Design a protein around this motif. Structure first.
Motif, PDB file in Angstrom:
ATOM      1  N   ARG A  21      47.038  26.044  32.088  1.00  0.00           N
ATOM      2  CA  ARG A  21      48.068  27.038  31.800  1.00  0.00           C
ATOM      3  C   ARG A  21      49.429  26.607  32.324  1.00  0.00           C
ATOM      4  N   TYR A  22      49.462  25.997  33.507  1.00  0.00           N
ATOM      5  CA  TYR A  22      50.754  25.626  34.067  1.00  0.00           C
ATOM      6  C   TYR A  22      51.047  24.132  34.001  1.00  0.00           C
ATOM      7  N   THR A  23      50.087  23.296  33.607  1.00  0.00           N
ATOM      8  CA  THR A  23      50.420  21.900  33.370  1.00  0.00           C
ATOM      9  C   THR A  23      51.156  21.748  32.054  1.00  0.00           C
ATOM     10  N   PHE A 136      37.120  34.033  43.689  1.00  0.00           N
ATOM     11  CA  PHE A 136      37.651  33.792  42.349  1.00  0.00           C
ATOM     12  C   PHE A 136      39.175  33.914  42.332  1.00  0.00           C
ATOM     13  N   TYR A 137      39.688  35.027  42.845  1.00  0.00           N
ATOM     14  CA  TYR A 137      41.124  35.248  42.800  1.00  0.00           C
ATOM     15  C   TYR A 137      41.848  34.464  43.886  1.00  0.00           C
ATOM     16  N   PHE A 138      41.112  33.894  44.841  1.00  0.00           N
ATOM     17  CA  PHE A 138      41.696  32.859  45.687  1.00  0.00           C
ATOM     18  C   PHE A 138      41.825  31.557  44.915  1.00  0.00           C
ATOM     19  N   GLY A 143      44.719  26.780  41.475  1.00  0.00           N
ATOM     20  CA  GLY A 143      44.893  26.115  40.197  1.00  0.00           C
ATOM     21  C   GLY A 143      46.289  26.302  39.637  1.00  0.00           C
ATOM     22  N   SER A 144      46.898  27.462  39.898  1.00  0.00           N
ATOM     23  CA  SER A 144      48.249  27.701  39.398  1.00  0.00           C
ATOM     24  C   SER A 144      49.234  26.666  39.920  1.00  0.00           C
ATOM     25  N   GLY A 145      49.049  26.211  41.151  1.00  0.00           N
ATOM     26  CA  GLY A 145      49.922  25.200  41.720  1.00  0.00           C
ATOM     27  C   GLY A 145      49.474  23.797  41.372  1.00  0.00           C
ATOM     28  N   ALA A 215      59.109  38.654  35.900  1.00  0.00           N
ATOM     29  CA  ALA A 215      59.741  37.736  36.843  1.00  0.00           C
ATOM     30  C   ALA A 215      58.848  36.536  37.128  1.00  0.00           C
ATOM     31  N   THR A 216      57.551  36.777  37.326  1.00  0.00           N
ATOM     32  CA  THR A 216      56.626  35.694  37.631  1.00  0.00           C
ATOM     33  C   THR A 216      56.575  34.682  36.499  1.00  0.00           C
ATOM     34  N   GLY A 217      56.446  35.159  35.261  1.00  0.00           N
ATOM     35  CA  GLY A 217      56.405  34.244  34.134  1.00  0.00           C
ATOM     36  C   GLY A 217      57.672  33.426  34.009  1.00  0.00           C
ATOM     37  N   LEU A 219      60.080  32.702  36.177  1.00  0.00           N
ATOM     38  CA  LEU A 219      60.236  31.742  37.264  1.00  0.00           C
ATOM     39  C   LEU A 219      59.241  30.598  37.127  1.00  0.00           C
ATOM     40  N   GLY A 220      57.944  30.910  37.142  1.00  0.00           N
ATOM     41  CA  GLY A 220      56.934  29.874  37.074  1.00  0.00           C
ATOM     42  C   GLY A 220      57.067  28.955  35.884  1.00  0.00           C
ATOM     43  N   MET A 221      57.763  29.385  34.838  1.00  0.00           N
ATOM     44  CA  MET A 221      57.969  28.486  33.715  1.00  0.00           C
ATOM     45  C   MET A 221      59.229  27.638  33.858  1.00  0.00           C
ATOM     46  N   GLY A 308      60.960  34.170  48.622  1.00  0.00           N
ATOM     47  CA  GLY A 308      60.913  35.121  47.526  1.00  0.00           C
ATOM     48  C   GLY A 308      59.561  35.167  46.844  1.00  0.00           C
ATOM     49  N   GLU A 309      58.840  34.049  46.842  1.00  0.00           N
ATOM     50  CA  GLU A 309      57.537  34.012  46.199  1.00  0.00           C
ATOM     51  C   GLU A 309      56.491  34.714  47.052  1.00  0.00           C
ATOM     52  N   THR A 310      56.548  34.529  48.375  1.00  0.00           N
ATOM     53  CA  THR A 310      55.594  35.239  49.220  1.00  0.00           C
ATOM     54  C   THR A 310      55.903  36.727  49.273  1.00  0.00           C
ATOM     55  N   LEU A 312      57.051  38.225  46.569  1.00  0.00           N
ATOM     56  CA  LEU A 312      56.820  38.713  45.215  1.00  0.00           C
ATOM     57  C   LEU A 312      55.353  39.054  44.982  1.00  0.00           C
ATOM     58  N   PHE A 313      54.443  38.159  45.376  1.00  0.00           N
ATOM     59  CA  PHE A 313      53.032  38.349  45.050  1.00  0.00           C
ATOM     60  C   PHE A 313      52.374  39.369  45.969  1.00  0.00           C
ATOM     61  N   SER A 314      52.947  39.584  47.155  1.00  0.00           N
ATOM     62  CA  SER A 314      52.352  40.511  48.112  1.00  0.00           C
ATOM     63  C   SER A 314      52.236  41.914  47.531  1.00  0.00           C
ATOM     64  N   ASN A 315      53.232  42.331  46.750  1.00  0.00           N
ATOM     65  CA  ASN A 315      53.257  43.698  46.244  1.00  0.00           C
ATOM     66  C   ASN A 315      52.361  43.866  45.023  1.00  0.00           C
ATOM     67  N   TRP A 316      52.303  42.855  44.158  1.00  0.00           N
ATOM     68  CA  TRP A 316      51.539  43.001  42.924  1.00  0.00           C
ATOM     69  C   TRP A 316      50.040  42.987  43.194  1.00  0.00           C
ATOM     70  N   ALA A 317      49.601  42.209  44.185  1.00  0.00           N
ATOM     71  CA  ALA A 317      48.170  42.090  44.448  1.00  0.00           C
ATOM     72  C   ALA A 317      47.576  43.415  44.910  1.00  0.00           C
TER      73      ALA A 317
HETATM   74  C1  YUX Z   1      55.677  31.703  40.130  1.00  0.00           C
HETATM   75  C2  YUX Z   1      54.514  31.591  39.152  1.00  0.00           C
HETATM   76  C3  YUX Z   1      53.170  31.482  39.865  1.00  0.00           C
HETATM   77  C4  YUX Z   1      52.020  31.939  38.965  1.00  0.00           C
HETATM   78  C5  YUX Z   1      50.986  32.762  39.735  1.00  0.00           C
HETATM   79  C6  YUX Z   1      50.026  33.502  38.795  1.00  0.00           C
HETATM   80  C7  YUX Z   1      48.905  34.221  39.550  1.00  0.00           C
HETATM   81  C8  YUX Z   1      49.307  34.670  40.959  1.00  0.00           C
HETATM   82  C9  YUX Z   1      48.088  35.117  41.775  1.00  0.00           C
HETATM   83  C10 YUX Z   1      48.389  36.255  42.758  1.00  0.00           C
HETATM   84  C11 YUX Z   1      47.143  37.113  43.028  1.00  0.00           C
HETATM   85  C12 YUX Z   1      46.348  36.852  44.136  1.00  0.00           C
HETATM   86  C13 YUX Z   1      45.221  37.628  44.374  1.00  0.00           C
HETATM   87  C14 YUX Z   1      44.890  38.658  43.507  1.00  0.00           C
HETATM   88  C15 YUX Z   1      43.644  39.508  43.778  1.00  0.00           C
HETATM   89  N1  YUX Z   1      43.072  40.364  42.941  1.00  0.00           N
HETATM   90  O1  YUX Z   1      42.014  40.898  43.564  1.00  0.00           O
HETATM   91  C16 YUX Z   1      41.924  40.381  44.778  1.00  0.00           C
HETATM   92  C17 YUX Z   1      40.866  40.704  45.835  1.00  0.00           C
HETATM   93  C18 YUX Z   1      41.364  41.764  46.825  1.00  0.00           C
HETATM   94  C19 YUX Z   1      40.857  41.512  48.246  1.00  0.00           C
HETATM   95  N2  YUX Z   1      41.741  42.133  49.212  1.00  0.00           N
HETATM   96  N3  YUX Z   1      42.929  39.514  44.925  1.00  0.00           N
HETATM   97  C20 YUX Z   1      45.683  38.918  42.400  1.00  0.00           C
HETATM   98  C21 YUX Z   1      46.811  38.142  42.161  1.00  0.00           C
END
Ligand code: YUX
Length: 415
Positions: A21-23, A136-138, A143-145, A215-217, A219-221, A308-310, A312-317
């Motif tokens: 996806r990102y290569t 899995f989500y770890f 892989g994204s990087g 924003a993620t898309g 930037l990452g692109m 900004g990236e750390t 950004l992802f903290s809130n969406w997860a």
């Molecule tokens: C700048 C472009 C970079 C492209 C990044 C694209 C994907 C970013 C992944 C961020 C992420 C991490 C973890 C999760 C997650 N979902 O469930 C769980 C389990 C909960 C346990 N506490 N973790 C979801 C999303």
């Protein structure tokens, strides 16, 4: 005893999924300079991929309940691996064929990233299934990087951009075979939609996640190409540094978000949305600082990207927790499906293309020159802080209804 292996194989498959996806993005500059296309071309690549993924997700979710999931999962893997490999041999004349390739890889990746989590969840028990879904989500951001890292490293080693698209399917085929071998063959929604649209905090969370996806898309692109243009006008390795940054900051940001929510949940009952809001504000500030730092020193630009990236992802997860707390468990599947669909449609299904369009429109109104190329890409990406701020305001709107809708949800689920 077999389940502990199938989960690892699906996790490695997901790593490879995001790697491809990102290569396609880590090698963007060479794709442009070869095909001779403008920024709208790369925007078209990524936007067509995402617009295929978000439409093929609910279909392969439907065909996941009816027919068996393992064979369709492996067919998806083989499909997107073979299509990436077969598009790696496209001549300099045909660009629409490479875009169609990205679309078919989008379908093949939607199948996998939609059907695999169900098998992961069904193979285990509650605590262990949560552990495995965490693995899995770890594996997602790793892989994204690795996408950027592998793309850039392979392109530099072989001297060609085709090899970044060649080297992945040799692992794709192996993973498809292993999933055919190891993984055991495990055996009205319109009312729900109307009710969810009647919901308020869930709708504001959906729009906030859509802004985060935008924003993620974008930037990452475009960030590797932007930084390369900066280095060029400041008279390869940049995508590698950015890949390391993202591969670290995924985990770092999810951990920071977990720490912030576990710390603030005790002070206020509307904690989680306020956590997301402050994270959005910080991410907007640091993203705005990225571009003003890139004109002087790239090290400051990398620092700003990382911060900004750390943030950004903290809130969406942690948005998935708001969704689970507000939605009663009888409609959670449709709620998460609609949220993913909308966060794609409004988010990264038109964002890379929009940034390419703005870059082109600003370039064509001035003299073409590497300086003006860099300034146009900077001014176009400067649209990302605005959408991040809008997502923050929507998280505030979410906070203004979290308690009430959570109360109603508890009332409905208790009976
Ligand atoms: C700048 C472009 C970079 C492209 C990044 C694209 C994907 C970013 C992944 C961020 C992420 C991490 C973890 C999760 C997650 N979902 O469930 C769980 C389990 C909960 C346990 N506490 N973790 C979801 C999303």
């Amino acid at each position: 005893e077999k389940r502990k292996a199938a989960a690892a194989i699906l996790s490695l498959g997901n790593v490879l999924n995001y790697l491809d996806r990102y290569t396609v993005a880590g090698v963007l500059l060479d794709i442009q300079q070869h095909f001779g296309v403008k920024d709208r071309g790369a925007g078209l690549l990524q936007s067509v991929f995402i617009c295929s993924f978000m439409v093929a997700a609910p279909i392969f979710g439907y065909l996941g309940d009816r027919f068996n999931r393992k064979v369709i999962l492996s067919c998806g893997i083989f499909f997107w691996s073979a299509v990436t490999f077969s598009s790696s041999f496209i001549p300099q004349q045909y660009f629409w064929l490479l875009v169609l390739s990205r679309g078919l890889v989008g379908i093949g990746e939607a199948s996998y990233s939609t059907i695999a989590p169900t098998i992961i969840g069904d193979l285990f028990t509650k605590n262990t299934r949560t552990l495995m879904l965490s693995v899995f989500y770890f594996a997602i951001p790793l892989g994204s990087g690795l996408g950027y890292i592998t793309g850039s490293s392979v392109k530099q080693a072989a001297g060609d951009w085709h090899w970044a698209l060649r080297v992945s399917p040799v692992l794709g085929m192996i993973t498809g075979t292993l999933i055919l071998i190891l993984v055991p063959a495990t055996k009205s929604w319109l009312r729900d939609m109307k009710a969810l649209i009647r919901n308020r905090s869930y709708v504001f969370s959906s729009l906030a996640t859509s802004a985060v996806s935008f924003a993620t898309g974008a930037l990452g692109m475009w960030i590797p190409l932007y930084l390369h243009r900066a280095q060029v006008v400041q008279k390869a390795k940049d995508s590698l540094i950015f890949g390391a940054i993202t591969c670290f900051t995924g985990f770092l940001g999810v951990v920071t978000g977990a720490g912030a929510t576990r710390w603030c949940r005790l002070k206020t009952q509307r904690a989680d949305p306020l956590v997301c809001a402050v994270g959005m504000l910080g991410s907007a500030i640091f993203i705005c600082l990225i571009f003003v730092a890139a004109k002087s020193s790239i090290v400051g630009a990398y620092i700003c990207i990382f911060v900004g990236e750390t943030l950004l992802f903290s809130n969406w997860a942690i948005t998935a927790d708001i969704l689970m707390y507000v939605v009663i468990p009888t409609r959670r599947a449709t709620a998460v499906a609609l949220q993913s669909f909308t966060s794609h449609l409004l988010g990264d299904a038109g964002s890379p293309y929009l940034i390419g369009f703005i870059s082109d429109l600003i370039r064509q109104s001035t003299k073409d020159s590497p300086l003006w190329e860099f300034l146009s890409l900077g001014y176009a990406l400067m649209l990302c802080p605005f959408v991040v701020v809008l997502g923050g305001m929507f998280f505030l709107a979410t906070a203004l209804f979290f308690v009430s809708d959570r109360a109603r949800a508890e009332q409905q689920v208790n009976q």
